[PDB]
């Protein structure tokens, strides 16, 4: 197992009904205390959207499993991934109920400036042709800090270190020129990455990216990290911790025109050039189309038959 | 089986490797007129965004519906099948990076009558369409297509109020007045009596609907209704797709004024906070512990 507490709230109210308790160690809450009361008023602001929307888009007229942040009884809000399930009314129009399961989220890191190795929580953040974050896998929460919630939206560029803007313009210029084909990878030196307290830490990342075929233009990017190493700070999700200054002219200004480029550059026109006429090789190679011809069938039969 | 051709598209530049036989009895293309072009080039432009966005996020497998051209210019509904399947990595005659392929298979849409005026059966269309509070239509099912003529697309983001009749727009009101009262019992429903929906060819269809909604119990707003239909009597033209010119009308002032300001009356009515009180209170909550743990006992070993 693990520390966590389940809570049955009531879809008529939103008003908690239950808590196992287990209540009591995972958040200090007094075995009772919850009932009666509001369950979103335990939700952190900048979370009750993300709430809202996962028991919208989950009710039913494994399942929905997200996170957000949670206040401690007697302040300090701590990371929490639910298990949201919905099930019909019990004991004595239809009832419903909403059974939340809360497990706390924990750090990944055990010592100041780890430099890990296979235990290594590897993750993927991907992001549009303007830069704005779009998706982020599980693992990143405990190696960042942030909840997914915290960073889509957010430009990528708000987590590079402000003296790497001009080494990363170069690692993105690269992810261009390998958009000439696609698939094509490739790992980048380790940088500096802006973590949720403020500390950075060094990233190591396989960039990779989609290319729209019919209009050339780059869909998104998606970097494949892990972390080289980690924060002056073990703890991940505490408050800012010292760590920040910078200055003022040469920098915000030089800086906001890097990202300028990189974005500009990112915008730009891809090159898939028609090299397949020679390729009448493989156009007349009876391999390929005996392949094709069974793809063709194995793809035909499965999805619109079954 | 069922009429279908299957393409396979090259996700390196986007135009079409291999193709059916079946092809030209479907769309009409003589055989391997569709090598070397680009694939898009055959999708309708109102189903571009949809075609490109679906790839994109997909990068059972991804299905949906996207209008085709035929060879002759009029276009045709076609669900669509995709699947990614790794390009064999070439024997080694020409590139050093992976290759991706896009399998296609289209299978074509045909309208659910036979004919006109069409009563009532099992055989009749059924389906659910969702529409926020604000009325904007976010969710319809695969089985409106045949029914409406409309793909998802086409409905999506569009108001569920522009479908009503304008004659109906007042008993329109005390239905939706009605989800409101209902609204105030989670999960209760009612059966309204058969109502104009506009479909895609201009005609009305009669659609006899079992309304539905969700409340977010912690706004006391209401998020979405949801209405599953049943297609009553079917529209006065069988096919749907095909825009036929025998419907129409207009009549400002009074109906395009009056009308337009009923929708807000609706629609604000829907903005109004569902009241959601207790006849149960503070202790009674606690009575329950040993209830709901062993509630939640069961939910546990599942």
């Known amino acids: 197992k693990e520390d ?40 952190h602001l900048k979370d009750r959207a993300t709430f809202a929307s996962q028991i919208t888009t989950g009710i039913p007229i494994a399942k929905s499993t997200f996170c957000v942040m949670l206040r401690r009884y007697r302040v300090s809000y701590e990371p929490f991934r639910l298990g949201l399930t919905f099930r019909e009314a019990p004991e ?38 303007t830069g704005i974050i779009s998706h982020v896998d599980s693992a990143a929460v405990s190696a960042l800090g942030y909840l997914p919630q915290d960073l889509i939206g957010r430009s990528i560029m708000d987590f590079y270190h402000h003296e790497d803007l001009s080494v990363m313009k170069e690692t993105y210029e690269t992810v261009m020129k390998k958009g000439q084909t696609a698939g094509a990878s490739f790992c980048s030196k380790p940088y500096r990455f802006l973590i949720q307290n403020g500390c950075y830490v060094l990233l190591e990342t396989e960039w990779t990216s989609f290319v729209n075929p019919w209009s050339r233009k780059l869909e998104f990017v998606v ?15 505490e408050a800012a911790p010292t760590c920040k200054l910078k200055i003022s002219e040469e920098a915000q200004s030089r800086n906001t025109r890097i990202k300028e480029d990189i974005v500009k550059r990112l915008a730009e026109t891809v090159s898939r050039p028609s090299e397949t006429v020679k390729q009448e090789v493989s156009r007349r190679c009876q391999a390929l189309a005996s392949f094709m011809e069974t793809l063709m069938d194995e793809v035909s039969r499965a999805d619109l038959k079954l």
């Open 92 to 129: 004595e129009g239809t009832n419903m109920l909403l059974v939340i399961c809360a497990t706390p989220i924990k750090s990944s890191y055990k010592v100041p400036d780890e430099i890990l190795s296979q235990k290594s929580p590897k993750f993927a953040i991907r992001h549009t042709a």
């Open 223 to 237: 970097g494949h990290h892990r972390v080289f190493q980690g924060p002056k700070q073990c703890n991940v999700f």
């Open 4 to 43: 966590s507490f389940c809570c049955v709230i009531s879809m008529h109210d939103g008003i908690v009904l239950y808590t196992t308790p287990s209540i009591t160690d995972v958040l200090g809450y007094p075995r009772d205390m919850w009932l009666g009361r509001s369950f979103i008023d335990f939700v």
